Design an enzyme around this catalytic site. Structure first.
Site, PDB file in Angstrom:
ATOM      1  N   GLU A 107      -6.948   0.860  -4.768  1.00  0.00           N
ATOM      2  CA  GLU A 107      -7.008   0.825  -3.309  1.00  0.00           C
ATOM      3  C   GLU A 107      -8.369   0.297  -2.812  1.00  0.00           C
ATOM      4  O   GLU A 107      -8.331  -0.685  -2.076  1.00  0.00           O
ATOM      5  CB  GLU A 107      -6.619   2.193  -2.706  1.00  0.00           C
ATOM      6  CG  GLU A 107      -5.118   2.441  -2.778  1.00  0.00           C
ATOM      7  CD  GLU A 107      -4.615   3.869  -2.656  1.00  0.00           C
ATOM      8  OE1 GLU A 107      -5.354   4.726  -2.123  1.00  0.00           O
ATOM      9  OE2 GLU A 107      -3.468   4.127  -3.089  1.00  0.00           O
ATOM     10  N   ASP A 123       0.912  -1.142   0.000  1.00  0.00           N
ATOM     11  CA  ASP A 123       0.000   0.000   0.000  1.00  0.00           C
ATOM     12  C   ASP A 123       0.962   1.204   0.000  1.00  0.00           C
ATOM     13  O   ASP A 123       1.624   1.447   1.005  1.00  0.00           O
ATOM     14  CB  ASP A 123      -0.921  -0.004   1.239  1.00  0.00           C
ATOM     15  CG  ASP A 123      -1.672   1.309   1.504  1.00  0.00           C
ATOM     16  OD1 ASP A 123      -2.035   2.007   0.521  1.00  0.00           O
ATOM     17  OD2 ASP A 123      -1.887   1.644   2.691  1.00  0.00           O
ATOM     18  N   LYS A 156       3.247  11.312  -4.153  1.00  0.00           N
ATOM     19  CA  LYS A 156       2.059  10.711  -4.758  1.00  0.00           C
ATOM     20  C   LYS A 156       1.145  11.794  -5.389  1.00  0.00           C
ATOM     21  O   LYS A 156       0.418  11.509  -6.348  1.00  0.00           O
ATOM     22  CB  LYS A 156       1.312   9.903  -3.691  1.00  0.00           C
ATOM     23  CG  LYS A 156       0.200   9.036  -4.235  1.00  0.00           C
ATOM     24  CD  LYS A 156      -0.187   8.000  -3.237  1.00  0.00           C
ATOM     25  CE  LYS A 156      -1.517   7.433  -3.589  1.00  0.00           C
ATOM     26  NZ  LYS A 156      -1.968   6.436  -2.584  1.00  0.00           N
ATOM     27  N   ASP A 205     -12.671   5.900   2.859  1.00  0.00           N
ATOM     28  CA  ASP A 205     -11.228   6.006   3.088  1.00  0.00           C
ATOM     29  C   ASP A 205     -10.778   7.395   3.596  1.00  0.00           C
ATOM     30  O   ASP A 205     -10.559   8.314   2.802  1.00  0.00           O
ATOM     31  CB  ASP A 205     -10.450   5.594   1.807  1.00  0.00           C
ATOM     32  CG  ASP A 205      -8.938   5.510   1.935  1.00  0.00           C
ATOM     33  OD1 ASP A 205      -8.427   5.615   3.078  1.00  0.00           O
ATOM     34  OD2 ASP A 205      -8.259   5.316   0.888  1.00  0.00           O
TER      35      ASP A 205
END
Ligand SMILES: Nc1ncnc2c1nc(Cl)n2[C@@H]1O[C@H](CO)[C@@H](O)[C@H]1O
Length: 385
Positions: free
Chosen positions: A175, A10, A71, A199
């Protein structure tokens, strides 16, 4: 041995996690400091390059040469309004190399520049070394996860980070798909299953709606706030304690960088205690001008300080439902992802919005994505033989 082994990674915005599926169970691998999650930070110093916890622990002393949020840049052009807007908030330099962003730093006394994929490859190399130290042998096959809204360019740049790190990337998976795999939601037999993944991480909030029709996954909707997460709740606590220090001592600490950072780390810790206790205590020796800051905060006060932020998480849930053309009663499963979903008030709000429904939360929410990726990596490596 090593050729029949695979890991699930992850690769998160603020934290990364690595898992391995062996002997019928997933093991989330602890780093050398005993932590099951590692900060996605890379620090460049006068003698060395630090990755993870050691990089995060020296961010205050070295802010210009400590890179994070790679990211947010991966697979993007320099001119992208997201890149341009984000650059205004980072303490490190972002430069333009042929319409591609590079992070520019000082390393061992020399000016060096790195592509976002090279920064992410250093985080991936660390995750690979954490798995190797636990397994006793080098593992090179990996499943890497990305947000469901990542386009082809962001996915390709993530795969390139994997190649630079020395990993054989079996697959780049979404994800929310890894999260639904973790809960075995793709093994319920026949008929379409509608799953909502909520999330809430350290710096981002994502809502995903998936349809699982006979093993096949389909993303129906994605919604959220790329600038909402756990760090906004810490800042609300910080502001409260700055005002409380001012009322008790008639002294403004806000301009003292060291005092604000020590207060921020203590608030983060207190926020976590408030997920399992109704009160948390702050114990800061000599916070400002030799004044100790020994105080406490209830969960009720913390919930008041963040009330507007917690309630704002329900607009993307509603937005994802209308985009997916689904009513609440049409969602079969609710899955919690990200450490901030441990906050009881967040769980109560989401459960009340879904009319008292049970939440899937038995897997550590900051570990569910690596868990699923580890399961997928085991299935994929077995079919490869
Ligand atoms: N017990 C907890 N109660 C509240 N927030 C938590 C908790 N654990 C983590 Cl991690 N976080 C936060 O989750 C993010 C990482 O996914 C960070 O913002 C961390 O503080």
């Amino acid at each position: 041995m090593a050729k029949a082994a695979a890991i699930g990674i992850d690769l998160g915005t603020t934290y990364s996690c690595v898992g391995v599926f062996q002997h019928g169970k997933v093991e989330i691998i602890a780093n050398d400091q005993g932590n099951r999650t590692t900060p996605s930070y890379v620090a460049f110093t006068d003698t060395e390059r630090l990755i993870g916890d050691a990089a995060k622990n020296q961010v205050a002393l070295n802010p210009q040469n400590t890179v994070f949020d790679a990211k947010r840049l991966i697979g993007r052009k320099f001119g992208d309004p997201v890149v341009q807007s984000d650059m205004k908030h980072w303490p490190f330099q972002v430069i333009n190399d042929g319409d591609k962003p590079k992070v520019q730093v000082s390393y061992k006394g020399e000016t060096k520049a790195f592509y976002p994929e090279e920064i992410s490859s250093m985080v991936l190399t660390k995750m690979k070394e954490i798995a190797e130290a636990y397994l006793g042998y080098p593992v090179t096959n990996a499943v890497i996860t990305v947000p469901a809204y990542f386009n082809d360019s962001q996915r390709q740049a993530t795969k390139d980070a994997g190649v630079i790190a020395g990993l054989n990337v079996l697959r780049i998976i979404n994800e929310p798909t890894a999260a639904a795999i973790a809960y075995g939601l793709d093994r319920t037999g026949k008929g379409e299953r509608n799953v909502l993944i909520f999330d809430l991480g350290g710096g981002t909030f994502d809502v995903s709606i998936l349809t699982i029709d006979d093993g096949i996954f389909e993303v129906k909707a994605t919604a959220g706030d790329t600038h909402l997460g756990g760090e906004d709740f810490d800042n609300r606590l910080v502001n409260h304690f700055v005002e409380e220090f001012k009322r008790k001592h008639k002294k403004d600490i806000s301009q003292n960088k060291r005092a604000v950072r020590r207060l921020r780390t203590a608030c983060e810790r207190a926020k976590r205690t408030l997920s399992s206790s109704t009160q948390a205590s702050l114990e800061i020796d000599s916070l400002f001008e030799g004044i100790d800051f020994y105080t406490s905060i209830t969960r009720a006060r913390f919930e008041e300080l963040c009330s507007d932020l917690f309630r704002s998480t329900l607009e993307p849930v509603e937005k994802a439902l209308r985009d997916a053309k689904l009513d609440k009663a049409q969602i079969h499963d609710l899955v919690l992802v990200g450490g901030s979903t441990r906050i009881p008030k967040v769980q109560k709000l989401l459960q009340d919005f879904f009319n008292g429904r049970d939440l899937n939360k038995s897997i550590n929410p900051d570990e569910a994505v690596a868990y699923g990726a580890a399961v997928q990596a085991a299935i994929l490596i077995k079919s490869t033989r």
